Amino acid sequence: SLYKGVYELQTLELNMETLNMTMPLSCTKNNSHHYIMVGNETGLELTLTNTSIINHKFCNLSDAHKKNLYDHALMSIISTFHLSIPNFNQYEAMSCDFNGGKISVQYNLSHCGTVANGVLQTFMRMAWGCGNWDCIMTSYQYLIIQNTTWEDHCQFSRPSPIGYLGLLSQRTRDIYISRRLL
Amino acid sequence: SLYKGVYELQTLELNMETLNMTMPLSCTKNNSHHYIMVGNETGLELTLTNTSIINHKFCNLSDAHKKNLYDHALMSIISTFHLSIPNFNQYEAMSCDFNGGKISVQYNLSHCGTVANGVLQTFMRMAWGGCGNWDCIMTSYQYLIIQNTTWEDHCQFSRPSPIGYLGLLSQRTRDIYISRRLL
Amino acid sequence: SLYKGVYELQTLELNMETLNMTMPLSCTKNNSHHYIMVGNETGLELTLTNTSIINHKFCNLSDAHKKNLYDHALMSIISTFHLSIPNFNQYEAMSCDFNGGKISVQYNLSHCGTVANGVLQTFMRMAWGCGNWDCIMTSYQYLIIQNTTWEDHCQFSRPSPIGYLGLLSQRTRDIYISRRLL
Amino acid sequence: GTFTWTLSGYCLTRWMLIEAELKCFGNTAVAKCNEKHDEEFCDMLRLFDFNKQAIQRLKAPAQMSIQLINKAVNALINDQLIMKNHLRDIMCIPYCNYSKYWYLNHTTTGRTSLPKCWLVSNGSYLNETHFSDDIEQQADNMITEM
Amino acid sequence: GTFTWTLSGYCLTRWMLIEAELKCFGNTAVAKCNEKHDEEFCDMLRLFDFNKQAIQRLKAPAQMSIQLINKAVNALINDQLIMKNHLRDIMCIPYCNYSKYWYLNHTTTGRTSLPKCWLVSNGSYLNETHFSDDIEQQADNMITEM
Amino acid sequence: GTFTWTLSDSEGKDTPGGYCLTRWMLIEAELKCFGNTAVAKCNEKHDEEFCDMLRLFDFNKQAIQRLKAPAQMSIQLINKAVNALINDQLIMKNHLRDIMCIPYCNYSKYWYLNHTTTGRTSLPKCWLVSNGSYLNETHFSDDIEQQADNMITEM
Ligand SMILES: *[C@@H]1O[C@H](CO)[C@@H](O[C@@H]2O[C@H](CO)[C@@H](O[C@@H]3O[C@H](CO[C@H]4O[C@H](CO)[C@@H](O)[C@H](O)[C@@H]4O)[C@@H](O)[C@H](O)[C@@H]3O)[C@H](O)[C@H]2NC(C)=O)[C@H](O)[C@H]1NC(C)=O
Ligand SMILES: *[C@@H]1O[C@H](CO)[C@@H](O[C@@H]2O[C@H](CO)[C@@H](O[C@@H]3O[C@H](CO[C@H]4O[C@H](CO)[C@@H](O)[C@H](O)[C@@H]4O)[C@@H](O)[C@H](O)[C@@H]3O)[C@H](O)[C@H]2NC(C)=O)[C@H](O)[C@H]1NC(C)=O
Ligand SMILES: *[C@@H]1O[C@H](CO)[C@@H](O[C@@H]2O[C@H](CO)[C@@H](O[C@@H]3O[C@H](CO)[C@@H](O)[C@H](O)[C@@H]3O)[C@H](O)[C@H]2NC(C)=O)[C@H](O)[C@H]1NC(C)=O
Ligand SMILES: *[C@@H]1O[C@H](CO)[C@@H](O[C@@H]2O[C@H](CO)[C@@H](O[C@@H]3O[C@H](CO)[C@@H](O)[C@H](O)[C@@H]3O)[C@H](O)[C@H]2NC(C)=O)[C@H](O)[C@H]1NC(C)=O
Ligand SMILES: *[C@@H]1O[C@H](CO)[C@@H](O[C@@H]2O[C@H](CO)[C@@H](O[C@@H]3O[C@H](CO)[C@@H](O)[C@H](O)[C@@H]3O)[C@H](O)[C@H]2NC(C)=O)[C@H](O)[C@H]1NC(C)=O
Ligand SMILES: *[C@@H]1O[C@H](CO[C@@H]2O[C@@H](C)[C@@H](O)[C@@H](O)[C@@H]2O)[C@@H](O[C@@H]2O[C@H](CO)[C@@H](O)[C@H](O)[C@H]2NC(C)=O)[C@H](O)[C@H]1NC(C)=O
Ligand SMILES: *[C@@H]1O[C@H](CO[C@@H]2O[C@@H](C)[C@@H](O)[C@@H](O)[C@@H]2O)[C@@H](O[C@@H]2O[C@H](CO)[C@@H](O)[C@H](O)[C@H]2NC(C)=O)[C@H](O)[C@H]1NC(C)=O
Ligand SMILES: *[C@@H]1O[C@H](CO)[C@@H](O[C@@H]2O[C@H](CO)[C@@H](O)[C@H](O)[C@H]2NC(C)=O)[C@H](O)[C@H]1NC(C)=O
Ligand SMILES: *[C@@H]1O[C@H](CO)[C@@H](O[C@@H]2O[C@H](CO)[C@@H](O)[C@H](O)[C@H]2NC(C)=O)[C@H](O)[C@H]1NC(C)=O
Ligand SMILES: *[C@@H]1O[C@H](CO)[C@@H](O[C@@H]2O[C@H](CO)[C@@H](O)[C@H](O)[C@H]2NC(C)=O)[C@H](O)[C@H]1NC(C)=O
Ligand SMILES: *[C@@H]1O[C@H](CO)[C@@H](O[C@@H]2O[C@H](CO)[C@@H](O)[C@H](O)[C@H]2NC(C)=O)[C@H](O)[C@H]1NC(C)=O
Ligand SMILES: *[C@@H]1O[C@H](CO)[C@@H](O[C@@H]2O[C@H](CO)[C@@H](O)[C@H](O)[C@H]2NC(C)=O)[C@H](O)[C@H]1NC(C)=O
Ligand SMILES: *[C@@H]1O[C@H](CO)[C@@H](O[C@@H]2O[C@H](CO)[C@@H](O)[C@H](O)[C@H]2NC(C)=O)[C@H](O)[C@H]1NC(C)=O
Ligand SMILES: *[C@@H]1O[C@H](CO)[C@@H](O[C@@H]2O[C@H](CO)[C@@H](O)[C@H](O)[C@H]2NC(C)=O)[C@H](O)[C@H]1NC(C)=O
Ligand SMILES: *[C@@H]1O[C@H](CO)[C@@H](O[C@@H]2O[C@H](CO)[C@@H](O)[C@H](O)[C@H]2NC(C)=O)[C@H](O)[C@H]1NC(C)=O
Ligand SMILES: *[C@@H]1O[C@H](CO)[C@@H](O)[C@H](O)[C@H]1NC(C)=O
Ligand SMILES: *[C@@H]1O[C@H](CO)[C@@H](O)[C@H](O)[C@H]1NC(C)=O
Ligand SMILES: *[C@@H]1O[C@H](CO)[C@@H](O)[C@H](O)[C@H]1NC(C)=O
Ligand SMILES: *[C@@H]1O[C@H](CO)[C@@H](O)[C@H](O)[C@H]1NC(C)=O
Ligand SMILES: *[C@@H]1O[C@H](CO)[C@@H](O)[C@H](O)[C@H]1NC(C)=O
Ligand SMILES: *[C@@H]1O[C@H](CO)[C@@H](O)[C@H](O)[C@H]1NC(C)=O
Numbered sequence: 004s005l006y007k008g009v010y011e012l013q014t015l016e017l018n019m020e021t022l023n024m025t026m027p028l029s030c031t032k033n034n035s036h037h038y039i040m041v042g043n044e045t046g047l048e049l050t051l052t053n054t055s056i057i058n059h060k061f062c063n064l065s066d067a068h069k070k071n072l073y074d075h076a077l078m079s080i081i082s083t084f085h086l087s088i089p090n091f092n093q094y095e096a097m098s099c100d101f102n103g104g105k106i107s108v109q110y111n112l113s114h115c116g117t118v119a120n121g122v123l124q125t126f127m128r129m130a131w132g133c134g135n136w137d138c139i140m141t142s143y144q145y146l147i148i149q150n151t152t153w154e155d156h157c158q159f160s161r162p163s164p165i166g167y168l169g170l171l172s173q174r175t176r177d178i179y180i181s182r183r184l185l
Numbered sequence: 186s187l188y189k190g191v192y193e194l195q196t197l198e199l200n201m202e203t204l205n206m207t208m209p210l211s212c213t214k215n216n217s218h219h220y221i222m223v224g225n226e227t228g229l230e231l232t233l234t235n236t237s238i239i240n241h242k243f244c245n246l247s248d249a250h251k252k253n254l255y256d257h258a259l260m261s262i263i264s265t266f267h268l269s270i271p272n273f274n275q276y277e278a279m280s281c282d283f284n285g286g287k288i289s290v291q292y293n294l295s296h297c298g299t300v301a302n303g304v305l306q307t308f309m310r311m312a313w314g315g316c317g318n319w320d321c322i323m324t325s326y327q328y329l330i331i332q333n334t335t336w337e338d339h340c341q342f343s344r345p346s347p348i349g350y351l352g353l354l355s356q357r358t359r360d361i362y363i364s365r366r367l368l
Numbered sequence: 369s370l371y372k373g374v375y376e377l378q379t380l381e382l383n384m385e386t387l388n389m390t391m392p393l394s395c396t397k398n399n400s401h402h403y404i405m406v407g408n409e410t411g412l413e414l415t416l417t418n419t420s421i422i423n424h425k426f427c428n429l430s431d432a433h434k435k436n437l438y439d440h441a442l443m444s445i446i447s448t449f450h451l452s453i454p455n456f457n458q459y460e461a462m463s464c465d466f467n468g469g470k471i472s473v474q475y476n477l478s479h480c481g482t483v484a485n486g487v488l489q490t491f492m493r494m495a496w497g498c499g500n501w502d503c504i505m506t507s508y509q510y511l512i513i514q515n516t517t518w519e520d521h522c523q524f525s526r527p528s529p530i531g532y533l534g535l536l537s538q539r540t541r542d543i544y545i546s547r548r549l550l
Numbered sequence: 551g552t553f554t555w556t557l558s559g560y561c562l563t564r565w566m567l568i569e570a571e572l573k574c575f576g577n578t579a580v581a582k583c584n585e586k587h588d589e590e591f592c593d594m595l596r597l598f599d600f601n602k603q604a605i606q607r608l609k610a611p612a613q614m615s616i617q618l619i620n621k622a623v624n625a626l627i628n629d630q631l632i633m634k635n636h637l638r639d640i641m642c643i644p645y646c647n648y649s650k651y652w653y654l655n656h657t658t659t660g661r662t663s664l665p666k667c668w669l670v671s672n673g674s675y676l677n678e679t680h681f682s683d684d685i686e687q688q689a690d691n692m693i694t695e696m
Numbered sequence: 697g698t699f700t701w702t703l704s705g706y707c708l709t710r711w712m713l714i715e716a717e718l719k720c721f722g723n724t725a726v727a728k729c730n731e732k733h734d735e736e737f738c739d740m741l742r743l744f745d746f747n748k749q750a751i752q753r754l755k756a757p758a759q760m761s762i763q764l765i766n767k768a769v770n771a772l773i774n775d776q777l778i779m780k781n782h783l784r785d786i787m788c789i790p791y792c793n794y795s796k797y798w799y800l801n802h803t804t805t806g807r808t809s810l811p812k813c814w815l816v817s818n819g820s821y822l823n824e825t826h827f828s829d830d831i832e833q834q835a836d837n838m839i840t841e842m
Numbered sequence: 843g844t845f846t847w848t849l850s851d852s853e854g855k856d857t858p859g860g861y862c863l864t865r866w867m868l869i870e871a872e873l874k875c876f877g878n879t880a881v882a883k884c885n886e887k888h889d890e891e892f893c894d895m896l897r898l899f900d901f902n903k904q905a906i907q908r909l910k911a912p913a914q915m916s917i918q919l920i921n922k923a924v925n926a927l928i929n930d931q932l933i934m935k936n937h938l939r940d941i942m943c944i945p946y947c948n949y950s951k952y953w954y955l956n957h958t959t960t961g962r963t964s965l966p967k968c969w970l971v972s973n974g975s976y977l978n979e980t981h982f983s984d985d986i987e988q989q990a991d992n993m994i995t996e997m
């Protein structure tokens with residue numbers, strides 16, 4: 004296939020797994036879940052469902068920071084995810100647990116002016132790869148984020164660090180003030 | 186007006202009202218009143234005056250966030266305006282009322298580096314187009330009220346533009362003091 | 369020297385003290401002291417030492433904002449220093465005091481992966497002086513920051529605004545979440 | 551970082567301008583907008599193109615959302631250009647408030663230069679004489695193509 | 697800010713390419729990256745060069761950290777490119793997946809082109825016909841310099 | 843985003859279009875003038891340290907000259923305009939060169955090829971620094987040779 008008659012076309016694919024060591028990578032696996040690998044040793048795991056793993060409304064951020072049993076990179080990514088919400092204005096929707104260094108965060112969801120809009124909009128950015136933009140409404144009720152080890156977690160898409168390097172600019176550019184002094 | 190024999194200079198002016206459905210339009214009625222309109226149905230009226238509508242230092246901001254009976258765009262604009270005030274430390278100056286979804290945020294301006302400098306600087310940045318003194322900005326008007334309103338033609342002193350808001354967006358959470366060790 | 373006949377390799381050196389009015393200027397002396405001059409009136413001495421100055425874990429920083437006995441530029445630059453600390457979680461690890469208008473901060477620091485590496489990273493970014501980026505520790509047990517006079521103490525390095533201007537951009541890029549609704 | 555938005559020559563309608571006919575700029579000026587980083591009209595044109603196709607490609611929201619623009623303010627316009635313009639305003643250098651623009655139009659062939667903005671000061675647009683030197687280089691660069 | 701990372705021609709080995717042999721590009725292709733704020737191959741070229749530097753010039757910690765790329769994300773890439781491609785994703789337009797690429801190659805001398813990232817849509821890879829205008833005009837622009 | 847500051851013009855030793863630096867700017871030197879050819883490159887090249895330092899010095903000059911002096915000095919203006927004057931990620935790249943134990947620029951000493959007869963000059967570029975000490979000229983002479991090769995291209 005000589006397009007200009009003397010130039011032949013050739014495709015190319017980039018194997019992003021070589022970036023495992025330094026950057027964190029992202030796969031989709033199934034449509035419901037979306038997975039993140041922070042190296043080959045630990046990695047976050049984002050799910051949507053109708054069940055609920057956290058049954059209490061308290062989260063205990065400050066206690067978890069005081070104990071410091073968690074892993075720094077994972078908590079950094081959860082921070083980038085949560086601060087990247089457009090209009091988080093419902094602390095009750097958030098809930099989490101940090102028992103013994105674990106990460107276990109959860110978001111409740113539920114005309115369209117709710118936190119479901121914001122969390123879903125940042126979720127689409129978190130793991131990447133034809134209705135309107137506003138009020139994408141997933142049928143599932145609760146979003147869960149957890150920590151997991153590394154296995155095969157790339158079925159729909161190959162690893163892609165696009166999303167994580169993408170929303171770093173969006174990490175704090177849409178936030179409502181919660182106190183007169185931030 | 187011919188230049189170099191063959192080039193004729195022709196002016197052209199852009200009308201930014203077409204951007205009303207995509208982004209806010211900031212404009213001026215006069216040096217006191219200013220209107221940041223969102224859509225054909227909402228807007229924020231900024232107004233300097235010696236009169237006070239807020240006479241209590243109880244914002245109840247987080248309660249209003251919990252209630253959520255306000256337009257989200259107006260609260261987003263308010264948060265962007267408050268976050269970008271350079272060197273805001275006196276918390277008593279701000280005083281907000283959000284009774285039943287209302288928006289009424291008053292900053293008490295009440296000597297060169299005081300809070301009124303940052304408030305008036307970000308104010309003039311909000312409503313652009315209305316020497317050499319970037320600091321020591323003085324204004325006789327004593328209080329700065331920010332009240333929601335419906336859409337009304339009040340862009341008399343200047344045409345509507347988005348440039349103030351878009352330029353201000355870059356400065357969010359860049360010119361603020363810390364308030365907690367862990368933040 | 370001379371290259372290619374008609375091209376002489378000249379040299380050029382920049383006196384950076386002329387910019388003292390417009391933005392802060394950095395410094396270095398010893399491997400510990402790193403002065404930074406906000407202008408021609410005062411600066412901040414940023415000294416590593418073993419001997420602390422504050423023996424309590426209290427600041428009352430909001431009271432410092434309330435009384436307003438300090439100078440705005442000093443609080444601004446130390447705020448830029450603290451916000452840019454990567455992954456600050458232990459708030460006990462820094463104490464401070466602002467009574468009487470004087471600023472006096474004390475970052476306590478004491479296998480690697482703790483607050484010490486982040487404080488030292490932002491410290492070397494404040495004023496420029498293997499594979500030592502992550503596991504960066506100093507023998508010194510405390511980092512004092514205090515306002516100071518204009519007696520020039522910079523011998524190792526000439527003044528330069530590069531560190532502060534570089535760290536201004538990376539302000540809130542690496543902050544953890546501490547509240548459900550920021 | 552720097553803007554990366556692509557434009558949809560380029561023609562400008564009657565409603566979208568003020569008492570103006572359908573103005574069309576050739577491909578060379580629009581291609582000039584790709585690499586330039588301080589052109590007022592190029593940035594405003596990218597904003598208007600985004601608005602133009604965003605109104606019709608996406609169904610209008612029942613509730614207006616500024617979330618769309620905030621997420622991508624930087625990809626369309628160099629905010630640092632706005633900072634430069636504000637710095638000229640506060641230093642009382644002449645400065646552009648993005649409203650009124652001028653371009654050198656060829657009388658016979660009809661080709662037009664890229665619009666450079668009208669620097670305004672003292673709450674009044676400057677006369678053509680007050681910055682005519684800047685117009686002269688705009689003519690001289692047009693001489694380079696021929 | 698804008699990308700400043702240098703490229704220490706540059707060849708991509710078997711590791712960063714899936715199912716391919718060692719591949720090399722001419723000096724002109726890498727040189728074109730340094731003055732263009734829209735390309736996608738330049739981004740991954742800088743990411744892979746930087747990554748290689750990260751392994752060889754920085755020992756692996758016992759607990760590896762993500763802070764290193766946080767503070768140096770926009771030095772390598774235009775994040776607005778990611779935001780813009782997100783906009784093409786949202787607006788039903790074909791967007792860039794950053795995964796599959798395409799590049800023209802000359803038969804006799806192997807004078808390649810800087811690859812332009814493939815535009816995907818509808819969760820599927822496009823037909824050759826849809827961007828046939830793009831590859832044709834790229835070929836015209838490439839034969840222009842000769 | 844990107845730098846947008848327009849460098850001022852010194853109409854002294856060279857015609858308008860060029861730029862110059864006084865004895866205040868430089869340690870152990872007199873007034874040095876660079877022609878329009880060098881300063882024209884600064885408006886397109888995003889990877890030049892000396893262009894950023896020139897923009898910093900020019901803004902400092904205009905601020906300390908035309909704006910009214912502050913009764914109490916503040917650093918608000920630079921805090922607003924730091925990314926507008928200069929590209930912060932150039933400082934990040936220099937920091938990366940430092941962290942990687944590679945030669946890096948600390949913006950102090952620069953080099954520039956100057957023509958013996960016609961007195962023309964290329965755009966200055968930074969003297970890289972390794973191991974806390976300046977490099978020898980032979981260490982990075984490949985860059986010097988390549989710059990001579992590019993310099994002959996114009997003439
Ligand atoms: C965006 O980039 C993504 C990453 O490259 C693209 O994903 C690739 O999409 C192609 C089709 O366009 C897939 O080919 C199919 O893959 C599915 C899923 O199974 C695959 O993954 C498992 C696990 O590694 C592997 O064992 C299988 O062999 C497949 O590779 C198969 O069911 C199909 O039969 C077919 O092989 C690629 O597999 C998929 N990448 C992977 C490996 O995840 C994505 O398509 C791009 N955007 C678009 C246009 O959708
Ligand atoms: C801190 O920043 C200040 C700016 O905010 C610097 O102030 C500037 O200092 C320079 C150098 O003194 C002034 O430039 C001129 O100074 C000469 C007098 O001394 C110089 O010239 C004579 C020969 O004429 C020479 O022998 C001396 O060695 C000096 O080079 C005056 O006659 C000129 O009119 C002019 O003032 C700047 O004008 C001055 N700017 C001002 C007023 O702020 C200060 O030097 C910097 N240094 C520190 C750390 O304080
Ligand atoms: C940029 O600055 C120029 C110069 O100040 C602004 O031009 C001025 O714009 C205002 C608002 O449109 C004009 O006021 C109008 O006057 C007409 C006629 O009396 C009236 O019918 C309107 O209701 C309004 O009062 C003013 O005349 C006009 N002056 C000039 C010299 O053109 C321009 O609007 C500014 N643009 C922005 C967005 O900053
Ligand atoms: C960039 O890095 C170079 C190399 O480190 C720095 O060169 C150094 O500049 C300082 C300036 O104070 C010199 O210090 C001086 O040393 C003499 C020694 O007698 C002393 O008399 C002076 O009072 C002053 O202390 C230093 O010797 C010189 N060399 C080295 C190897 O450090 C350069 O200053 C750096 N520039 C910046 C601004 O980063
Ligand atoms: C690049 O190199 C040229 C020389 O090839 C430099 O021009 C020179 O400028 C200096 C300024 O002091 C001249 O020095 C003085 O010349 C006068 C006589 O004109 C003499 O009486 C003084 O004792 C002193 O020697 C130098 O002669 C002159 N050379 C010429 C004729 O070009 C130019 O400044 C250099 N530019 C840079 C920045 O590298
Ligand atoms: C979330 O925090 C609340 C509040 O208690 C705080 O956090 C605790 C971990 C501990 O440090 C307390 O001193 C703090 O004040 C927790 O609610 C308490 O839970 C404990 C058992 O965990 C129970 O004994 C108390 O009665 C609860 N209620 C209180 C103090 O009002 C909650 O359990 C924390 N959640 C998690 C997952 O740790
Ligand atoms: C920091 O404050 C603590 C706590 O006191 C609170 O803050 C004070 C500024 C004041 O507003 C108090 O009423 C607040 O309760 C001080 O520690 C002790 O505070 C108690 C009262 O809670 C007081 O009776 C003690 O004397 C304080 N202890 C000492 C040793 O003074 C603390 O002193 C304050 N530190 C500084 C540096 O100002
Ligand atoms: C993670 O990425 C690293 C990048 O170095 C890969 O390490 C290389 O792996 C190949 C294939 O086994 C070896 O031939 C190279 O010598 C390795 N290079 C190194 C360590 O510098 C590693 O394979 C990747 N691992 C996974 C699970 O994807
Ligand atoms: C998530 O939010 C939904 C909102 O519907 C909560 O559902 C409520 O559950 C309580 C349980 O006591 C019922 O009494 C209410 O009638 C339900 N509806 C509403 C509107 O409150 C649900 O409990 C929340 N789940 C979590 C885990 O927070
Ligand atoms: C907001 O902008 C929209 C979009 O341009 C405007 O809607 C147009 O209004 C004109 C009025 O003559 C109609 O002819 C067009 O058909 C409308 N649609 C479009 C897509 O242009 C609207 O008028 C503007 N509103 C305000 C208050 O300025
Ligand atoms: C705005 O702030 C000023 C200055 O603090 C307040 O004026 C003081 O008000 C108190 C009571 O709150 C009086 O006792 C003082 O005498 C007033 N001082 C001065 C200098 O006027 C003013 O009350 C505040 N206004 C509002 C509406 O909160
Ligand atoms: C500002 O926003 C408030 C929010 O309530 C508006 O209040 C309206 O008040 C009328 C009269 O009681 C009610 O019928 C409406 O339902 C309220 N609207 C809304 C959206 O809540 C108020 O009108 C707005 N404008 C001004 C100028 O205050
Ligand atoms: C700074 O932190 C270090 C490390 O935690 C503190 O050193 C410990 O102080 C406690 C105080 O109860 C002593 O019991 C321990 O013996 C000390 N540690 C060791 C290893 O000896 C130090 O006190 C802190 N300094 C402050 C807050 O000024
Ligand atoms: C830091 O600044 C404070 C506030 O200026 C200094 O504390 C005193 O401030 C008053 C203000 O005029 C001076 O009269 C005193 O001389 C200052 N302290 C004393 C007793 O000398 C504080 O000293 C400064 N700390 C420094 C510069 O080391
Ligand atoms: C482009 O095509 C040329 C061949 O025209 C490739 O260069 C190599 O040429 C030799 C001699 O003809 C062959 O034996 C090699 O097999 C060719 N390499 C390849 C990859 O086939 C050149 O590598 C091609 N470049 C690309 C990346 O398209
Ligand atoms: C796979 O995808 C389906 C989509 O419906 C989902 O129900 C399921 O939980 C996903 N995960 C696994 C492990 O099957
Ligand atoms: C991950 O890769 C590293 C590379 O050094 C290797 O040592 C380690 O065993 C691998 N597995 C895990 C779980 O870390
Ligand atoms: C400005 O206009 C307002 C109405 O928007 C009016 O009440 C006020 O008196 C005016 N102020 C002046 C002319 O100073
Ligand atoms: C509002 O502030 C008042 C001040 O007394 C406080 O008592 C009250 O609880 C607050 N109300 C709400 C609804 O948060
Ligand atoms: C730096 O070294 C000198 C000489 O040993 C010493 O006197 C000085 O105390 C050291 N640092 C400081 C500023 O204390
Ligand atoms: C995409 O293809 C599907 C069928 O696979 C079709 O229903 C849809 O309308 C097409 N358009 C989109 C969403 O891109």
Ligand SMILES: *[C@@H]1O[C@H](CO)[C@@H](O)[C@H](O)[C@H]1NC(C)=O
Nearest residue numbers: 819820821822823824825826
């Ligand atoms: C696109 O069209 C080409 C040419 O007919 C065909 O080979 C290819 O399969 C098509 N791709 C899709 C996704 O329909």
Ligand SMILES: *[C@@H]1O[C@H](CO)[C@@H](O)[C@H](O)[C@H]1NC(C)=O
Nearest residue numbers: 975976977978979980981982
């Ligand atoms: C650099 O030059 C100095 C002075 O001639 C010399 O002493 C030193 O050994 C040289 N180093 C190298 C390897 O260039």
